[PDB]
Each structure stands twice: as C-alpha cells, then as structure tokens.
Write a protein that binds this ligand. Sequence first.
Ligand SMILES: Nc1ncnc2c1ncn2[C@@H]1O[C@H](COP(=O)(O)OP(=O)(O)O)[C@@H](O)[C@H]1O
Ligand SMILES: Nc1ncnc2c1ncn2[C@@H]1O[C@H](COP(=O)(O)OP(=O)(O)O)[C@@H](O)[C@H]1O
Ligand SMILES: Nc1ncnc2c1ncn2[C@@H]1O[C@H](COP(=O)(O)OP(=O)(O)O)[C@@H](O)[C@H]1O
Ligand SMILES: [Mg+2]
Ligand SMILES: [Mg+2]
Lengths: 527, 74, 78, 526, 525, 212
Amino acid sequence: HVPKAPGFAQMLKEGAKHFSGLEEAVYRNIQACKELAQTTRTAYGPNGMNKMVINHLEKLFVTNDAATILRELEVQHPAAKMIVMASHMQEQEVGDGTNFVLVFAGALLELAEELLRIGLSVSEVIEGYEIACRKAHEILPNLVCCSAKNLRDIDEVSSLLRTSIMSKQYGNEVFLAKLIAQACVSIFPDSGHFNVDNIRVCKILGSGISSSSVLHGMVFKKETEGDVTSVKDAKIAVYSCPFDGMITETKGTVLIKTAEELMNFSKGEENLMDAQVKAIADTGANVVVTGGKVADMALHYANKYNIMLVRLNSKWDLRRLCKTVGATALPRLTPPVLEEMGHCDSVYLSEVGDTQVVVFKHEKEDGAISTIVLRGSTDNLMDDIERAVDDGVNTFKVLTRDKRLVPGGGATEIELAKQITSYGETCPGLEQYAIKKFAEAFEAIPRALAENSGVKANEVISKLYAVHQEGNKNVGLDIEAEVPAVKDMLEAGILDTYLGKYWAIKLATNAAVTVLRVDQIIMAKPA
Amino acid sequence: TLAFDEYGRPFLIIKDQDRKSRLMGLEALKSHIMAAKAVANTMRTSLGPNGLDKMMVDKDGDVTVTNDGATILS
Amino acid sequence: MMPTPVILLKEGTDSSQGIPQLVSNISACQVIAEAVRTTLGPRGMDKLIVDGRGKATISNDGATILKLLDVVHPAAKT
Amino acid sequence: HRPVLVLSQNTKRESGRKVQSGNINAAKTIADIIRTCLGPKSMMKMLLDPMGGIVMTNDGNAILREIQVQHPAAKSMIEISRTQDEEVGDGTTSVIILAGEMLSVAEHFLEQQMHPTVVISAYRKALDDMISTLKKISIPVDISDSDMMLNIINSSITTKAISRWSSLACNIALDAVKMVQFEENGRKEIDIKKYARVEKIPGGIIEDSCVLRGVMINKDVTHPRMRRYIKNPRIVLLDSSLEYKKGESQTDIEITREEDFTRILQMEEEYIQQLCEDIIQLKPDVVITEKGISDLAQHYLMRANITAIRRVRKTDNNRIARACGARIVSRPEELREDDVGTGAGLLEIKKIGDEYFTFITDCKDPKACTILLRGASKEILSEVERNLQDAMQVCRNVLLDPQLVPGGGASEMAVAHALTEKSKAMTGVEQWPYRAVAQALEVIPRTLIQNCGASTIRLLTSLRAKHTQENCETWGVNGETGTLVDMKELGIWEPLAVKLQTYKTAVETAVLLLRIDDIVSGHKKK
Amino acid sequence: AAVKTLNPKAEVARAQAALAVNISAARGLQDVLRTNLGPKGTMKMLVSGAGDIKLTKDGNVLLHEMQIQHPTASLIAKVATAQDDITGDGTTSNVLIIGELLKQADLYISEGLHPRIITEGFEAAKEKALQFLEEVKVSREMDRETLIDVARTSLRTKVHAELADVLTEAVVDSILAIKKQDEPIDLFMIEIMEMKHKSETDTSLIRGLVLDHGARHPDMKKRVEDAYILTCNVSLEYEKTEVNSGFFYKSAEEREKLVKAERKFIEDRVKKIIELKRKVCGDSDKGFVVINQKGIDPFSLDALSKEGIVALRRAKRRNMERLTLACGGVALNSFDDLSPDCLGHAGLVYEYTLGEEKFTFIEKCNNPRSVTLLIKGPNKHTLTQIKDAVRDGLRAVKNAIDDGCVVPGAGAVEVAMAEALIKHKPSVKGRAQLGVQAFADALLIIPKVLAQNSGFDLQETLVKIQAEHSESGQLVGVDLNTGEPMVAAEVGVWDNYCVKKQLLHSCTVIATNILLVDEIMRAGM
Amino acid sequence: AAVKTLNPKAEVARAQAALAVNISAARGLQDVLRTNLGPKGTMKMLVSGAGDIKLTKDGNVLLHEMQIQHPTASLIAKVATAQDDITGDGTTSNVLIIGELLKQADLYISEGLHPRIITEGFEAAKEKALQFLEEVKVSREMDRETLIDVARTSLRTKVHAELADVLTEAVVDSILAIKKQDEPIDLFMIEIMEMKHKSETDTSLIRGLVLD
Ligand SMILES: Nc1ncnc2c1ncn2[C@@H]1O[C@H](COP(=O)(O)OP(=O)(O)O)[C@@H](O)[C@H]1O
Ligand SMILES: Nc1ncnc2c1ncn2[C@@H]1O[C@H](COP(=O)(O)OP(=O)(O)O)[C@@H](O)[C@H]1O
Ligand SMILES: Nc1ncnc2c1ncn2[C@@H]1O[C@H](COP(=O)(O)OP(=O)(O)O)[C@@H](O)[C@H]1O
Ligand SMILES: [Mg+2]
Ligand SMILES: [Mg+2]
C-alpha cells in the first residue's frame, strides 16, 4: 500500500542525527543562538529585570547578570554553547560585559542570516566581518575622552565605579560605590599587581543594605572554645598543624614494661603539653589559630595562660589570615616564634544577625586586606549584591591594567556604527555588505537599552545619529524618564571598561565567525 | 482556582499540595471538640469506685487490663 | 503546536514571560500570607502543622509556621 | 480520587512574542518547501499518498495539498494555494513565496516595538498602490489573433513539464477553450471543467495526443449486431430507463383467473415496445441513456438498425449534449425534432488496449470537447492533466480580461520602484513598513536566479538599476540562460488576472497572520 | 529539513539523497529482471501467500507479483503495465533501458554536472533514434511466412523451444482467419480455454468455439453432427412479474390450474423453438443446439430433450459475439421473428467430460472468423506459462499486420542505433554532448544482457558486433548459440516496430522525470 | 545459504552482494570527507554523547568520532589511523582514493569482468606510479624558507589562514632548534601546552619549557 523512503548512501548511524547544508545546519544554528539573544535582552542595561533561574539542584538564583544565568541553564544546542563560552571568557578576562557578548554576537548571526538568504555565502560574510572588526579596534582608542589617572583615592573612584553598579543595582548605586571605594583602594599594592582574591564577602543575614560596611580584616563564622574572647594586644601565632600534640606517623604504640612507666605516662604527657603552651605564652602571644583539631589538654592550658584559640577548618582561609595579620603558618608543633608572629589591632567576638563571628579588625594599620560585610533581608538578595560587588572589584583591576575609558550608555556603539558605515561605503568590492551589517549590529545595542526603559526605540535611535554630526562623539542615552531628550555622558559620568569594550567586540566577533564556519553537523546519541 | 492560575500557568506553592489537608472554616474548632469528647466519653465509664476497667492489647498481642488514665491513653 | 525544532531550547524547560509572570508572583505571595494572617494580634489564633513523619508542631510565630509549610514556589520563598 | 478544581481543562494557552514570531516561522517553513518550483529550471517533487498512490509533480498547488500539517498558521497557507488554484491557473507557487517574504519583513518590525496594526495599515496602503502600477504597465491583447494567444499559454507552461512538447500542448489548450466558449443568452461563460474533460489512456506516445472535435467515453455497444461505425448518426439522448420497474406506490395485483398471469407478462413486453416505437418516429441512429436497457428493448432496436449505449454517466451526457446539440429528455413519448442530435460527425467504436471506447467526433460546431491524453503510464499522464488544467485556465483569463503583465521578474521590479518613489512623500512611522513591501517583491526575481544557479548580488544590483529609468521598465530575469533579457524580445508574458490575484492574496495572508496574538488549542466541538 | 518541522512523522530525501534512492532502486529491478531476457533466460517461480506456484519469466508478471515496497519500483511497474497492455512483448527490455538511463547518467551528475543537462541530451538523442528507426524497418507486405518468424521470436523467449514449434502454428493460423480487407483485428474473437487432457505440447487450434459448459440434461445427445445453432438471449427459466402480485385461489382444483397457467408464458417460448425444428425439413438427423446465455429451468430442458434439441445454459457475454460470427446466425433477444435465416450451421457439435466438468466443442464451419486455442497443459502453473505466451504472441502478430513494416531482431536494431548517435554526437553543439553518450550506452544493454544470459563474454561480444557493423552495411546482431555476430534479418529473428518505438519514448520520458526528482517525501498523516 | 543452515542467526552476503556492500559504504565515507579537503573545505562540528564540541575537519578525527557501525567503514578507519600516526597529513586524501578505486572498478566488474582482473591492473599501475613519483620530486637541500612553504600548505588546510601565518613561524622555528648534523628529530622534545590567556591568534614559541 503506502511506500516509504529508505536510506540512500551513508545511513549507517544507530540513532544519531546528521545536518548538512545551509538550511539544515547554518540557518538552524542562527535561529538557536537568536533565542539566547532574545532571552538576555530584557536583563541588559540599568533598567534590566531579574530572572529566577532554578538549576538541577533545585535551588533559586535570581539575578540580572548574563554570566551567572548561562551557568545555570542546561543548554544542549552545540552552536548555542559557543556564545555561552564566549561570554564565560569575558568574565575570566575582565569580569564585566558578559552580556554585551550575547547582544552583539546575537545580532551578528541574525544579520548574517539576512546576507546568506539574499547574497554572499559564508566565505565572504566571514571575511567581511573580519575587515570591520579590525577597523573597530582603530576607533576605540580614538573614542577615549577621560582617564582614571588623577587622584587615585576614594573620591574619584566613587564616581568611576557607579557604571558597573547601576547596571545591576540601580537604586543602590550610591551606597555600593562608597563600599567598593573603601575596600579596593585600601588594598592597593603601591603600584603593583591588584589581586581580586584579597576582597571577601561575608554574607550576614539581618537588616537591609544600609547597615553594610567594610571591615579592614577578616570575618569568620566559627567559635572560640574558650573565655579569652577579649584580645587587645593581638599577637597572633598561626599554625597549620592540629593543636593537640606531636604524634608519630607510621603506626604509634606505647610500650609499657613496668609499673613505673605506666603511672608516669599520663602525668608526663600533661607536663609535656604544659611546657609547649607556656613556651608561646612567654613570647607574648594571645591568639593561637590552628588548622586541625584541638585536644582537651590543649584547651586546659589555653584558658590557664589566658590565650585565645581560633579553629579554622578550611585550609584556604588559613592562608588568607597569614596575609591579613602578617604571619606564617608553621607546619611543626609550637615553637618559640621569633619573627613570624601576627600583629592585628583588635580581635573580638560579636553576635551580629544571630551569628557569632570572629573579627580580626585593624584600626591603625588599615591597609593589609579588606572584607565587605554585606547585610540583606533574604539570602537571595545578598548573592545578587555579591555579584555586583565582584563586578566592582573586577572593574578596579581593569583600571589598573589600562586607565583609559570610553563613554558608555549607548554613546560608544553609535560612533562605532558611524565609522564602520564610513568604511563600508568606501570599499569597492562585494564584501561591503557585511561591513554595513557589522555597523548595524552596534546599532541594536542602544536599542536594548531603550526597550528595557519603556521607550520607543525608533525615536531613540533617530536622535542618536542626528547629534553625532562628526564632532560630538559623546551623547548617549538618558533613561531617567520618558520622552528622553538625551544628554552628554561625560557630564553625567557614565563611562566604564575601555578594555572591557576591547575584548567584548573581539570575543563576540570570533564567536559569530565560528558559528558561520560550521557547515556540517554530526551529533551523537545523547546518553 | 487551585493548582492553576488565571493566565494558564501552573500554580504550585508547596510540595505535594494536591495530597494535603487544610481546614480553617468554622468546623476546624468543631473537629477538635468532637475528637476530644470521644476520648472523654471513653474515660467517663472508668471513673470512681464503680468505674469499669478497659482491656488494652499491644502490637505484639500482649493484653493488659488497665484502669488508670495514664496507661490507657498511652 | 508552535515550537517543534530538531534541537530543543535547553532540555524541556517552561518559562513564563511578562505581565502574566508578575501577577503569578503577587498572587502566590497572597496564599502564603494566609498562614500568618490569623496569627496577628492578641485575638489571633495559632496553627498546627504536621509533617510526613507525624510530628506535630503547634505555633503562631512566623519563623516557625513558614519553615514547616515546605513552600517550593520561587517568589513565595522571599 | 477527587477531581482537581481547574478551569478550561485539557487546553493550551499561548500569547505574547511566541505567537507573533511563531506564525512567521511556520510561514517561512512552507515557503522553503516549494522554493525550488518557481523558475523554468525547477525540478519535480515525488510525493506519497495515504491511499498508496504517487504524485510526482512540481506544481505548487498539488504539493501543498498532499502535506498534512499540525501548526494552525501552517493550515492557513495551504488554503491560500487552494484559492489561487480555483481563481487562476498558474497562480500558485508565487503567492506562497511572496506571503512568506511579506511576513519575513513583518517580523523585523515586530521586534522594534511597533504595533501589528501599523504594519497592516501600511500593507493595505501598499496593496492599493500595487494594483494601480500593474494597470499602467499593461498591454492590450488581440484575442482574435491565433499566434498572439499561443505566446501567452507558452509562457505559463514553460515552468511545467510540458515545455518540451510546447508546440503540441499550446495548440491543444487553445482549441479546448475556444470550443467550450458557449453563449446562449446574453452572458458569456467558459466552463473548462464540466465540458472540457481531460481523459488519459495509458499507452502510445505523447506526440499522438490531440484534442478531439467532440466527446469520447469508455463504453461498448449493447449488442454485437449493432453498428460500430456510423457516418452521420442522429443521436437521441435519454435520461430514464428502457426497462420495466416498480412504481412509486404499494401496487399489488390479485391473480384469481388463469389468463391473468400471462397477461401481465405480455403487458410488460408491450410497454417496452410502446416506448421503443416512440423513439423511432424521429428515425434516429444512436440511443444513449443513463440507466439500464432491457433485452426486450435491445431486440426492437436491433431490427430497426439502432446502436444503443447502456450506462453512460450523467456528466458525460451533459458533455455530449453540447457537442451534438441534443436535448437530454427523460420521457420517450415526449420526444421532439429539436431533441435529436443532428450535425454529429463520425461515430466509431475503437479499441485502445483491449478495451472499447465510444468516439463521437468530427462535429460541425461542438460546444464541448475531450482532450485525449496518451502517454507512458498513469503517473506522467496525471502531470500532463494537471498542466493542461493550468494551461486552459490561463487562456480563460485572457478571453475575459485581455491584458498582459511582463512576467519573469519584470512585473515585481516595476512596482518595487513605484513603491520606492511613492514612499518619499509619506513622512511618518508607516514609511518604513511601506518600504518593506517593495523589498518583499524582490523574492520573485531572487527565485529565478537561485534555481538556475546564477549570482544574486551582481544581477539584482544591475536589475534594480535598469528600473531607475522610466523608459524601459520591462526588463526581467531570463531563467533559461541566467542573464538580463528584455521581455519584449523573449515573449514571457503573464495575464493581468494572474498578477492581480497574486498580489491581493499575498498581502491579505499577511493581514490575517499578523493580527494573531493568541492561540487556544485543546477543546472539542459537536 | 522543512518537512520535519511541520510534520514530525514525515520522512524526506534531499537533492543528493533522493537521486541515490531512485538510481539504486532502478539497479535493483535491473539485476533481477536481466536473468530472463531472450530465449536463454531462466524461469522464475513466484509463490504468493496462499502457496500457489506462478512459474513465469515475463517482465510484467515479475514486477507485479514481487514483494517490494518502494516508490521508485512503483513508477517502473506502471510503465511496464502499459507495455503489456497495448502491444504485448517489450516489457523486460523496457526496464533494462530505464536501469541504464539512470546508471549511465549517474556517472556525469555525480561528477559535477546538473541533472537537467543530461535530460537535454536525451531529447536530442531521442530525435535521432526515432529517425533512425524509420530507416531500418523492413516492409514485407505481411506474408504468412514472415508472421511465423515474428511469432517464433516472441514464443521462444517464453518456452523451451519444443512448444514454440507448436504454438506458432496455433498463433499465426489463428490471427489470419479473423479479419480481411484492411480491418483492425479484434483480439476478443479468440477464446483461450484451459484444459488438462494430454500434455503441454498438445495445444491445437479449434476452428470454431470451445464452450466450458455442457448439456444440463441426461437425455440430451452428446455428439451431434450437422447441427443448427440457435443463439438466444431470452430467459427460459421461470420469472415473475416486476410488480409483486402473487396468486389467489379458492379450491384445490383451482390450485393446479394456476400452476399450469403460470408456465404458459414459459412454454410459449419453448413452443417457438420446437416449431422451428419442424420448419427446417426435419425428416433427417437435423441436430439443434441452443447455447442460450440466460438460464433454463429443468421443465423446459425436459421438453426440449423429448424433441431432440441440445440446450446449453449460462453462456458468456462475448459468446454471443464469437459464435454469431462462427455460425453466421443472428443473436436474437426475442422469439417474435424466428426464421431459418437466423440459424447457424456446424458440422460437428460434441462434448467431453474432464473430471465432472463438460466442455462443449463446436467445429467444422465454413468461414468462422473466430477461433479458439485449446490449451491442454498438465499442471495448473503450466497453464499460466502458455496463456501468458499466447497473448504475448497474439499481440506480436497483430502489430505486424497493422503496421506495414517489420523491425529486425536482437542486436540488429540496438547496436546500429547506438553507432548512429556517436557520429551525431557533435551535432548538439553545447553542454549536452554527454547526454547523447549516456543514451547511446544505455541502448547497448540489449546485446549485453543477451550475451550474458547465454554464457558468453559481455565486453568481448560487443567489440566483434560493433566491428562488423562499422566495416559493413548489414545490421548485424547477437547469436545466442555461437557468440559470433550474425545478421538478424536473414536468420529469421524479427521484432515489432511499435515495441521499439515505444521503448524509445516511454523509457526516455520516465528517465528524464526521475532524474529531475529531488524531494522524495511521505506526508499526509 | 550454507551459513544460514548451521547457524540460523548468522547473516551472510554472496558474491554479487558483498561487493555492493563495500562499494556503497566506500561512497558513503567519500561523500562526507570530500567537503573538507584543502583550504577551501568546510568545518565539521562533532558532538559526542556528553555534549562537548569537537570542531575539526581532519580526516582521522572525522572517521574516529563518527556514529557509523559498518565493517567496510571500520577497514578504512584502520588505514586512516596509521596515516596520521607516522606522517601526519594525508588522511583525508587517503579515503578519497579508496572511494574512487572501488567506484571506477564498479563500472568494469558489473559489465561482465572478474574482480581479480582489475586487481592485476592496479599492481601494474602502482609500479609505474611509484617510479614516476621518484622523477617528479624536487630536492631543495632543506632550506628554512622551503620549510615555511611546506608548513604553510599543511596549516592552511586546518585553519582560516589568519593563524596559519602565526603557526608557520611557531612550527618551522621549533623544528630547527632540536637536532643538527643530520640527526633524527624526536617529536617528544616539543611540549604542547593549552592556555586560555588572550586569543587564538597569540600562540607563541617558548624557547624553553612550560610546566602545568
Ligand atoms: N546611567 C546610565 N545611563 C544610560 N545607560 C547606562 C547607565 N548605566 C549603565 N548603562 C548601560 O547599561 C549597560 C549594561 O551592560 P552590562 O549588562 O553591564 O554588560 P556586561 O554584561 O558586559 O557587563 C551598558 O552597556 C551601559 O551602556
Ligand atoms: N522563460 C522564463 N523566463 C523568466 N521567467 C520565467 C520564464 N518562464 C516562467 N517564468 C517565471 O516563473 C514563474 C512561475 O510561476 P508559477 O509557479 O507557474 O505560478 P502559479 O503557481 O501561480 O502557476 C512565473 O511567475 C514566471 O515569471
Ligand atoms: N531467437 C532469438 N535470437 C536472438 N535474440 C532473440 C531471439 N528471440 C528473442 N530475442 C531477443 O530477446 C529480446 C527480448 O524478448 P522477449 O523476452 O520476448 O521480450 P521482453 O524481453 O520485452 O519481454 C528481444 O529484444 C529479442 O531481440
Ligand atoms: Mg555592568
Ligand atoms: Mg506555471
């Protein structure tokens, strides 16, 4: 009766699919990456919306940063993973602009579909995108108007860090800018390498964001097991061995042969531990922090000679304490410490937010390390501010590597859209269509800023080209109210991450080119 | 409606809410009295010197004839 | 009937969008507010929550009632 | 088991961007199926039927009717090609590509936070300007000329599979419409479906196929003594039976005497001989009816030298009534001289492949003809039958509207420059969707070069520059070679009713599918 | 694919995929059907689901009774159906041209070229192949010795050459005594009866008719000489009125009067028959045979048996057409104008019983113009061998009488046609130069298969045949006994003109349409 | 069949059947691997069951990471494995010769001839082709500008010719500073480290070592 079509030449798979051509492979990779660009388009900008994303571990992640959203979404399309790993490389390089990659490369592949269906194949759209990408790296040093050079203190960086804060925390742009100014400048290495790992976030559940502060030191979440919690001298002896004595390594066996060696063994072990605790009490130590466990005999002489004990079960937190108070973790049992002692100002305990913490607070010598103690009503809010805190530390490392800045908020992408269109009209070849489409991908980036603010993007994008008549080069977007009448970005102070714009254009161009190189897809059976 | 929204989305608040039981009403206080009166009507016949005993059987089959109110309800 | 691709979106995930999402979050917070609504004021009653093991916990505190409801809604966990 | 307190059980709800941008992808999917079936360099598409048959064709209407889709917006595009198939002949594949392209540019404006009513109000203003452009570039046709009408039907079958036998299929389709063009009262009508029957017989060659001057049926004579070759027969068409049947009553006869039973059996024979004597008063030669003929009626027509055909169909009786000029009567005692089919030519009972065929041909002025198709098998004869139906309807549109539009890409580019010059005086938010209608018409010259393998960049830049001047305005795309040849020299001309129905249906398909922002599925009915 | 998005249960084939489906399936039908072309082919035993044996090797019966479910195989089976419908032979050679028109074209389409360029070369090669076929046909004025060699060629290729000497005398002598004076010969006048009497090599040609039903009364004569055929169409059995009437009687004496009166109209038809026997001078033997297409009740059979009239019943529809020409009477539908002018005549009318199944024989006619081939095959499957070969041979001699020219035999046509396309290959002057080469090499499969089934070499035979054609003017062919090139016009191997004309037309159009197919898909669910 | 008699669960292929199995499978691997030969070839994205992207177009990586279960496809994959083991390049061109040696021989074996007669002509053609290869080889005394053009040909057929100018200076300059005085060059002395620092067009040649 009804016939059917069998295999033809190479149907040898056991349950796997195959894609070949432009319509089955190239056009389907574009439409799959277009859905990720339309997903994070709402969360882009200062007026972006959050997204409650639940992973496979059945926990809640609510954020507006596009980097942490893609880590929880279990994407299975292969070409869609290329735009996720390109956004993950933006977080590892500069730490800001991960969403800029999804909008630009999502518009590069979308406008490439209009070129393959009207004209040139992938051999000339790719070569056309590479010419406009090299010309885009020549306009970005010409768009630099300000620099983070004069008065590197807490006053100038309080305004230069507001752009990375207001894109994810719009209402808290003033409080979080001052908290990131008293923490990043205080750990300055005196013209050296700025380490972003020297800033920790201690999430304390409690009151709102107005009670958050930055403490010069470290705040832990453990106990003391003692009664010497009030320490004012703060001479800290840091150890990595377990503070319970010196045991052997191979087997361990007490060998008793007479009645005198049995009775004197218990009293001789207590006198041996008594001589080791009093050896560090005569050196002036007050805080003894160990990594391993602590026996009951070590706690007996810790309270007798009035020294405080701190238990640190994490081995990574012990190395950060050595850079906090300026000490060295000794692997052997307690010696007379010559010069590797710690020196803090005040080590105390306080129950803040129904959580007994241990604070190594520096008062006079303020700059050795910083810890931003964040407060919040929910645990999900403190994770979102911590992402905004880490975007402020990563922006400070960008200004250490390169002090140049470009006016953001839509002012950079319009001038990049005007100069590439000028190079496209002066190219007497067939690849000038991809150069004109490369400049229109920069046009869609302030389009996402106006659609998230409830403003019509047609009237917004028309006023940007009207005020960019060859000499302004700075007017961006005013998203404070409807009927914008947009203003200057240097007067408002919206400029951030010139090095972030240098890498996000390069990564999104290489991501969109790599998708267009894929002509034949051979997948396996998922298991 | 329950387990569905007005926009067509599934409306799930707590886990396994279809197999739950919730009574606020006016019979939630009435269900507490009728459950407590049947315990008091059982212990009413075992009060005083003419109070008749009760035969209690354990889970293992052991039988204990009790009259005190502590071991009966336990 | 609309989405039928050869490669799906992520695995099988459903996601609401826009104005029906926001009213879905507001009406979800109204249901979980009824478990602390009758516990306010000196003329407020208490509530009894029984888990799967049969352990009864009668209380009127908001930190005690809401932790025993086992709410799995994302907006109602706030 | 307690029921769940729900509302609108077992149905779906979907709104927002997933329905507006979801119906575009369903329209782009159908337009990519028949995209390789527009130019003259097209290829056939073999289809498989649930009955077990095979439809090997390249016509855009016959492909989409064999596709069962589940998407609701995909079901709308199939009914568009069914509308274009009934109005005109060769107006099928062009509307589905054009409606997919007008929705392709409509998806761009839906992402710009523009309301769909603004795009439709710009589509209706653009639709009213495409009708006025085709009426200015048209050309009057001399319908009395034979060589002018052959060039119109050759332009419609160059895409189809009968372009190889173009010298034969043009003469068949032209003579088929000019025979069935009947006008009794003051109203001209052309019925090429009820009177121009296209019968196919497996065997022979395609070059021996010709339109007969008359009708033909697959029916043998009722008796071998009847003549199978009459020079000039007088055909009498009947509708009732020549038998003895029960009346529409409760008739019952009580037989008490001996002579009563033999009398009723004799009155049944005299009743048949009475109606057989009433049909021989006009001296006929051929008696054709629709119901059965008893053997008592075959005996009286045998000795009267009358050839009788038994069970001719009702649609075949209406077709032979126009060819021979006879009247289909339903009463043998009410026959008149006007009901006799005089003027009929040669009648011959031929045999084509071990089966008799009754031929009634060589008529004086027949008003209904039958196209005799003979080919290799029934597979390719269904292709020529579907192509001649697209070849006779494009001749019907010229005889009712003698205006020609320069096809082959010259029709779409003459309006796309007219919409571009008229868009300069818009000065509003509807100016940009007005420009996209002129860019959506570019998909018809895009398809003619993508099928032959030509370049789409070097050709469309030169073709758009040819319409910048108002003098030439008729330069199209030559699908045979792949260069730009003027259509006044090639001879590719499409009728006005084909191009007007193509533009009116492709816009209103985009009008319907853009106002859809919600889809409810899962409910039942009666 | 686009069809997978709309319908998820719809398979599809792309441009380079659907071409490999149709070509590899055409090689599947080619490699099976090439083992039966010519007299050296092998017999194929075809068993259905019931278990009956269909032993035949005709190309039309092989394609229909084959358990294959493929869309490409259904297209070739429809072209093969019309080849065995209008002209008989030419079905096995039909499939082998399509199997080579797609295989020789695959060598160019896979090597960069477009399939439409090959189809443009097929039309230019078909125009030269049609003109060359009209130059090689031989008009021999339809001699009766020429029609023997035409029927011998079509019968050898279906039997083991011991029955081909018997069936040629039964086919040629049957087709000559049907119609004269340039009249189209109707093949319905030849009856084909299947018997089981002696053996397969005993099929004779009865000059009259052989009816498969006998006398339905034991008192009738079994052997009747010098008979009168009365062909009737009336119903002698008891029939009622069309209106439901019934009977009504009062006494029992009036009951028997109604049974006598209800048969009066029946016996009036029988009294017209027995009075016709008395008006033809019945003072002799004077046998009477009534074939009587409609049924006869046993009351009228008992009345006709007492007068000595053999009466048959339940004849066929065409038995009133074949016996009317054979006996020379008039097939009447009534008994109102009975006369001796409508009576027939046969010298011998006898019957014979073969396992409780009588067979009425009518022989010894003057000018019958209607004969009957009496196939007497031993087995049931052997009857299908002879019947499918008789209609293959009857349609071969019918085309040789209607067409005025005869076409030569095995390799005298296909080799000479392929050499004519080589010298006219630079005449196209374009990209279709390789299309004429693919058409010329596809026509050479007929000497290649005949050299392969006979056991000879394939390439070594085609060199010697093309050498004798290029160095002479005689249309040389293939010899299936020695392998040497022998002329087919002299050894008595002929063919039909309409078979070779349709082989150049039906195979070429179905090859140009298959090569232009790139979207094989199954939708509609 | 005889193998079906003793073992009923044992499929078999006859003389004219097993030839069509190997030829149709050789054209299956030929039509896939012919779209990536040379610099103008197309890239292939290979996804395994885990979900990792393996974007490459080398003939050895394509045949190994392909969902194919065929005995003829496993024979060509064994020959393609030894091509990329001893001399590197020449794996994509290896499969196309095997796919054409069976396709060109299919036109003669199906036309009456024996498969052994075709194999007698392959050996007589291989001896003349091997002697012709020794006459067309060009000796240029191993100049460092000659090795640039040798490395440029092999690198352009695996990258988009922007990294081929960078990797040529990293391959030729790395192979010269290993051994001198006509000594066999050991490829184990070159370590291949994978970083993520800047970009794909930043691969430099460290003159010492890089430890992970
Ligand atoms: N005050 C402001 N006015 C206008 N636009 C702003 C303002 N602050 C931030 N933006 C815009 O919001 C966008 C936020 O981008 P973001 O999501 O941080 O990129 P990434 O994901 O790469 O970090 C920037 O492109 C910037 O132009
Ligand atoms: N020789 C030719 N040169 C250029 N274009 C042609 C030629 N022949 C046909 N065409 C184009 O091919 C198209 C075929 O349209 P078609 O699919 O037949 O429409 P429909 O489906 O309504 O019948 C026509 O619009 C015509 O412009
Ligand atoms: N005696 C013979 N000698 C040589 N060739 C023959 C002979 N008889 C038949 N042939 C060849 O066999 C071929 C096929 O014959 P046949 O099987 O009857 O027709 P088909 O193959 O179309 O069914 C013919 O083309 C004819 O040339
Ligand atoms: Mg930011
Ligand atoms: Mg057409």
